[PDB]
A = this chain, B = another copy of it.
Amino acid sequence: MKYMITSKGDEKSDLLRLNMIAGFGEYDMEYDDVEPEIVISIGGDGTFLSAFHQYEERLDEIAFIGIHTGHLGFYADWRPAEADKLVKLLAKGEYQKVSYPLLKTTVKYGKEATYLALNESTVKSSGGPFVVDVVINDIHFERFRGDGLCMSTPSGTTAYNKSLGGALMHPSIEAMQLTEMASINNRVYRTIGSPLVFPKHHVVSLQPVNDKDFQISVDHLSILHRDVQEIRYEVSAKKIHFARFRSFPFWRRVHDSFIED
């Protein structure tokens, strides 16, 4: 089986990578970073995001797995002391897989650009104010005036979505959640305020009102897009597959990351 390993780049993560490579060398496993089948991230959830985004074209062929060299992450949720136990059961195979839904983000121009997000996708204003019309299934819902909006995946609800008052939902719920950023609500302007959770096949469209330029963000990426006609949010048809070798529940992961561990 083909495999590759991504490291954060510091001292402990590079040394743990060369130890797993030497450990994989004692099995029929080829190190291939072009067309792998198991992608291992050593470092943190940020190191996991980069590993996901550089192989997002082969998502239905990869089983991801995360190793945190620092504090517990939600994707890098396996301690470095479990690496030598990890390489064996990965080499034998016969493991199980769990899948998390993804978020498709479409941007139209006066061309079209499609992105895939594991955590969330963000839209801010480029300098001046931020005003957009929110369309839900071709039905105008609200005129949002604030700092920006955030559409997050279920697994991304623990990330920047949480800091915006959003709710935490289990990654088995194939849905997406929209949150607001310092919305202006007065006697003339009105926003819903509450976060919105949309099921599959529900299309949330953002449409400009004046400025056609927005700082559009996808996970770690953040690019200023010019002359935007509409931004289209919906649950992606593609999923990310995790290699399941143990029982680490999602509410378990939330407990250790925010309550204490």
Using a CB–CB cutoff of 8 Å, the interface residues on chain A facing chain B are 71, 127, 136-137, 139-142, 146-147, 160, 162-170, 172-173, 175, 177, 181-188, 190, 192-199, 202, 222, 249, 251-252, 254-261
Assess the B258–A186 pair: CB atoms within 8 A: yes
Residue on B nearest A256 in the bound complex, by CB: B187
Contacts of A222 in B (CB 8 A): 127
What's the Cα separation between A140 and B254 when bound, in Å? 12
Contacts of A260 in B (CB 8 A): 187, 190
| Minimum Cβ distance to chain B for residue A49 (Å) | 14
Assess the B251–A187 pair: CB atoms within 8 A: no
Residue on B nearest A180 in the bound complex, by CB: B163
Given the known A-B contacts A187-B261, A260-B187, are A141 and B251 also in contact in the complex, defined by CB atoms under 8 Å? yes
Please list the 4 inter-chain residue pairs (A to B) with the smallest Cβ-Cβ separation, ordered nearest first.
Answer: A169-B197, A167-B195, A163-B182, A167-B167
* Seed contacts A163-B183, A192-B254; 4 additional CB < 8 Å A-B pairs: A166-B167, A167-B197, A168-B197, A169-B196
What's the Cα separation between A255 and B182 when bound, in Å? 20
Assess the B182–A164 pair: CB atoms within 8 A: yes
Assess the B173–A196 pair: CB atoms within 8 A: no
Residue on B nearest A171 in the bound complex, by CB: B199
